[PDB]
């Protein structure tokens with residue numbers, strides 16, 4: 900159809916899986932800090948950085964995690980990595 904384009908859809912919601920709208924860091928990880936109030940203790944920003952992620956996702960620096968935001972599964976092969984681990 901040629902309908903998809905690099906740019907997002909007209910809707911472009913402010914919210915996103917990649918960016919936790921609550922604590923700003925449970926996106927990649929699990930909802931653990933969401934339960935706890937950030938007011939009592941705000942998370943320390945990581946000064947160290949490398950590869951400069953597309954947005955601000957910490958783990959994306961090492962290996963991109965655009966799989967969560969994208970509803971459609973990549974279906975890419977696991978490859979050597981992600982296997983043969985200790986547990």
Ligand SMILES: [Zn+2]
Pocket residue numbers: 919920921922923924925926930932933
């Ligand atoms: Zn969160």
Ligand SMILES: [Zn+2]
Pocket residue numbers: 917927956957958959963964965
């Ligand atoms: Zn990510």
